[PDB]
Amino acid sequence: GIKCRNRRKARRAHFQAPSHVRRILMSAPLSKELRAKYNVRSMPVRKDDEVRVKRGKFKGREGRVTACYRLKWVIHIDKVSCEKANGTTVPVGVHTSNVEITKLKLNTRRKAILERKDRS
Amino acid sequence: PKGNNAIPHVHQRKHWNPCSSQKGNVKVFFNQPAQKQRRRRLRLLKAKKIFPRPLKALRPQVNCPTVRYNMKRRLGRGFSLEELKAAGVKPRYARTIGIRVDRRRKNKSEEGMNINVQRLKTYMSKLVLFPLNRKKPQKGDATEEEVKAATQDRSRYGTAAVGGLVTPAREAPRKVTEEESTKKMYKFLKKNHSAVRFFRARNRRAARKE
Amino acid sequence: THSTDLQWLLVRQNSKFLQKRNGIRLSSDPFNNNANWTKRQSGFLNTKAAVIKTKGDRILLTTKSGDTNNKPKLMYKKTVMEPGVKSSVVKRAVADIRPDLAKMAYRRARKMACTITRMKKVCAARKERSSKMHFHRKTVRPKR
Amino acid sequence: STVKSGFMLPAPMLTSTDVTRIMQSEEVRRVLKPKKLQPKRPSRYRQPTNGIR
Amino acid sequence: FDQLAMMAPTGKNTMLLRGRKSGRESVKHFGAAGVPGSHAKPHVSSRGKERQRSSKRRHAFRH
Amino acid sequence: PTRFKKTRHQRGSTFCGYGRVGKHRKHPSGRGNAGGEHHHRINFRKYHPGYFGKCGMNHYHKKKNTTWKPTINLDNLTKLMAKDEAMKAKKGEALPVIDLLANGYSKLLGNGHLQAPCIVKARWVSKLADKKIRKAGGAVVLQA
Amino acid sequence: RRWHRKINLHQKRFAVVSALAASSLPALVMSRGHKIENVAEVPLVVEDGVRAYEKTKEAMTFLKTVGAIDDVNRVNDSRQIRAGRGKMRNRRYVARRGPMLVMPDNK
Amino acid sequence: PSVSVYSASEDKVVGTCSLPAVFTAPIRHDVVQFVHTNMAKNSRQPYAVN
RNA sequence: AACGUGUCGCGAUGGAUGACUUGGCUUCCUAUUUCGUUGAAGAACGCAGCAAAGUGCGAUAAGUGGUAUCAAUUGCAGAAUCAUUGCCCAAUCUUUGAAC
RNA sequence: GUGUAGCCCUCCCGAUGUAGACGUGGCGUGGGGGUGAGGACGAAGCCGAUGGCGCGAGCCUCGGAUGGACCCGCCUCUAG
RNA sequence: GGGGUGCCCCCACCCGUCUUGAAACACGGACCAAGGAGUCAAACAGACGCGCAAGGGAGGAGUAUUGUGACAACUUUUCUCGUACUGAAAGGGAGGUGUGAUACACCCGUGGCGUGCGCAAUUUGUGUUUUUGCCCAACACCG
RNA sequence: UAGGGCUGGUGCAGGCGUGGCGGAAUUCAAUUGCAAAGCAAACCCGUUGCUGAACAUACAACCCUUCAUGUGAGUAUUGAGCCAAAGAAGGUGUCAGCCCAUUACAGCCACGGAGCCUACGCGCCUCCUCAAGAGAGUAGCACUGUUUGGGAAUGCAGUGUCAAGCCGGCAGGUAUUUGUCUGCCAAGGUUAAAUAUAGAGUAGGAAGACCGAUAGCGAACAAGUAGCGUGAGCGAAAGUUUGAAAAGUACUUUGGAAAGAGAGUGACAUAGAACCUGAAA
Ligand SMILES: [Mg+2]
Ligand SMILES: [Mg+2]
Ligand SMILES: [Mg+2]
Ligand SMILES: [Mg+2]
Ligand SMILES: [Mg+2]
Ligand SMILES: [Mg+2]
Ligand SMILES: [Mg+2]
Ligand SMILES: [Mg+2]
Ligand SMILES: [Mg+2]
Ligand SMILES: [Mg+2]
Ligand SMILES: [Mg+2]
């Protein structure tokens, strides 16, 4: 419920959100196969999940989520990285709305969420 | 150069304006549409809570004073003790069933008294008076399913049972009487006016005559 | 209803058909033979009107006749003319409804004839230049 | 009007608009002054002056 | 007026009238109230502060 | 609106219509109605001759409600009746009854020509109003 | 400062009456900027079955049937971000005005 | 004059009415402009400096 | 001749303008609405693995306890429902200060 | 058809000016209501032996080996 | 045709201000950017625009409404200005013609005179009628 | 007989409160400079027809030749769809109803110790209930002072004097004495609602024809801070706005270092770290 007729108020609420709010704001759509199975449009992303990037320089790349850097509003994906001058490898952040979820790390709490959001 | 202007008399030399050194003395009305909405909301809320009692209690009809408003009628504060006795209602019990009571009014003429007595009698015949105990009804009270037919009144003036104010009807066309076409009404009225105006002077003349 | 004189007084200063760029007052009214912003030329508020335009390689003459002035769908007619039509017959087709536009009708009919001829020549020349040069791409709109 | 107390539609100032039709009417045209002949357009060969020479 | 031009052009059989202007309140204030033979109404804000006794008034007539 | 003021016309004139010699200063003649008997005497005497001085008796606690007495003339009595009633009654017929207190009037003055006879109820009446209404076929009934 | 204004009651009713009559002339309607080429019989009056619609899809079909969809499309294409400081003050988008629909009540 | 009523589902005429005579009234665009200018001032909110 | 002057291309110095805005100012509304000897408001000194200011806290000292949610916090370490996050019932609460 | 890129064509008479008054379909700036457009094939801003138009306030095109995201024409309302 | 730079012959006292009089041996004046001064309210008057008109207009309140909703719509007035003035006050309070010396009778009407747009009727341009608005001088009526 | 939940004890119940959960539809099809672009002049024709003055790969600075190197991210354009009781305005590497979060009850869950509301909510025990008089250092009066529109004295204060109630006292806007009439009954106390919040708080909300970094609060920043004064007090400047992302320049060479010359990242380094644009003097 961040969006408001007040632009000044809506932007303050977004950029000063606490950690538990930022978890919901960082959500990604499910793939077509997952949608046909669980009947859920989208879910919040978490570590050890598999995603495919859809927008940006890395298009079509797949990998496993390594970190959810909520302080920078980005997620880290393995095999999505850049080289430094010294040769060191560093991860590159990608916004969660530019990806899609292909595999979910199932859990008894995560299963409860899917049954909550099941539209059927 | 001033010319032909009125002398102003504007009356504004008393530090009413808020500035860097003065708090000021002002009153604005920016909350007028908001306060109108709030008052309406409270009236609807009160009606829901006190249902099915009428919104406003019964009031009497009175005459306005002075010669400017002699012919006008309005609503008074409460009913007179003489009026309540004439309709056979005790004053302390009357306040219980929604009748305003005024212990200061005087009832100086029968015309005003008779109008207000009729107001109470009509209100009494229209009351339904839900019983205090539904299992044991005492005294003439509402019967069963007469309670279920009650309805709140929201007339803003409490005129659901009594109605509006009573004023004499306008006269109808007629013919001029033979004496009306002869009598000099200014001579009639001036003679009476002079009797009071020159009461002191005429007495002084007779006393000097002795 | 109301008259042309009253309606012109209402819209003369401001209208969506009035273009006042660079101090020049012209008109974008579709039923204006020349773009002059005047009461006589403005055919949208006139009871009867006629304008001359082109439809491919033929002269197209739309008329109002002012009998269905409350039904926008039936206000105008199309009346496609024959190929190689003389400007005198177009001049006589107009002036049966607006005799005060007969001389403007002849000049417009001649200008439309010349533009049709030029479009054929310009397109023919442009196609010849495009025949020899090679192009990196070509877009075809899908059917159905 | 019943909803608005005492309101009526205002009366027109003109019983008929289209003053152009009135100007171009037989009755109005019957009282207009007749047209007069105008001089010829000044040709080339500017007209003389100077009276004496 | 568009009916008049229709039936009576050139104004045959007409009577032209104007309407009064001398009774207006603004006209009553023209002039100075304090000069002899004036009869001009002053611009008064406080009616009770400009009463004046019957004597001490200006002369009502002048040639 | 600020765009219609003289300030917009005076941008660049340096004096705003107040002159170079006698400038725009603050109160060169005093504040308010100052000096009305010393250096503004001619203005006061010419336009407000009755300003200075006293006149008449006093009246504490006026109570304006006791002197309420609106007046109406015999010439305006038709405005208090129905339109049909004005021509319906004459001389020996049944006449309409007008009550002045309901309409907000106290005294009946007699000025002008009376139109139709009627019966008028009033608190006060005049000498002339009484005579004129009686001759026309009406009467006055005193009220309180 | 004097923010509000009073207007004579009769003058306000005169203005409404004049605006209603102006909406009855197709020449004045086109001159204001509305697209009414496919409409028939201005002023347009439709049956009362419109009040019983429940789905927005049904409403859109009705607008296309009577030819009022062109004015709706004109408003849709004109939506854009407002120029100037106004976009910082809670008015970020501007759009044009389309058709009216008048109903006997709020039902 | 007469006004026709069109159906909401197909290109058809289903009724007939009369002009309500409010559309015949004079058009005073100078009055409309004056009333609109002053009516549009009544939604304003106040502003001021401290 | 050098110095000095003028026009043009390029480069310095300086921080204007435009576009941005989690700030101000102004108006309106709603409450189970109003501190303290059961020690307030203010003032001082301390507390983190690396921690100057600011923020939170008080020797239980960037927090103990209850509750809902679940995988983070992140500059580098380091640990792996129990943390973090939001809210709140149970607690701790250094030296002073009406200070008794 | 007062006033504009003046509806058009002939003819006659005046044209300087401090303080001051008045007029102008006179110029320009920030914002509101309408209407019509423009922009990553490059918006605002900035630069100029870039010219054209207007008595003038000014407007517009051109080039940038400048910039990198918004902005304007017309009718009206408003002002720090 | 426009633009830039130089040259020749000719012309040409430093801007703003107070002042009778400034190029002044009268005052303020090194350069650039951004700021910088007739505004808001209230009482009255005149000109001009708009609505209604012997009447005009409210205000405060109330009635019906997440909707362009602090808007918009709705409510013989209940108040105010005006249709009547005059006197310190008690108080009084204005039509015309005719006939007589709260008088009597009528009611399609400018109190009379002069100068008076336009219209009407005559003579061949003049004279005449009704005169609107305005102004002048004499009545009459009200306090 | 009846009642009192506001006599007291003991229990059973709604709602006010707090914390959570739940809503549709494209990352659809065509690019990596130039066709991911247009034309068919109101509406239909058009679910259809026709293409190219940037390619005989153009542009890149006095002219010609060779050899080179150069276009960030589709929320842009075009064509097809779909949702709408939702078109709502925030985020996302460019302008987004269908990428994300939001948008609702025409709702669903757990918690709830005091309080407030509901046949004055509902049982049981206990208790409870159904001729006189009327305010004394008071009111009044005198003098003095102040206050008021209150004028031979509107309210109050000080001192002096100081009542009536057997035809009482106070008020009735010009002083005194006398007689009527009208309205009230001082000198003890409590009391909701409609009203204020003109430099206050505690939690929430709603906005704006307002200002836009010399403006708006002094303070958009570790601001009542740094600094100044013995003290009472006074009181700033300053947008970290590089970039989508630090990818924040490895390495070679000269130099004591700072740095320079090359190399490299990035669409752009004349975006290189008080780093958008970058004017005038
Ligand atoms: Mg003078
Ligand atoms: Mg101060
Ligand atoms: Mg001058
Ligand atoms: Mg002046
Ligand atoms: Mg002077
Ligand atoms: Mg001149
Ligand atoms: Mg501004
Ligand atoms: Mg001197
Ligand atoms: Mg000088
Ligand atoms: Mg000298
Ligand atoms: Mg008390």
Ligand SMILES: [Mg+2]
């Ligand atoms: Mg500041």
Ligand SMILES: [Mg+2]
């Ligand atoms: Mg400051």
Ligand code: NA
């Ligand atoms: Na701008």
Ligand code: NA
């Ligand atoms: Na000096």
Ligand code: NA
């Ligand atoms: Na005493």
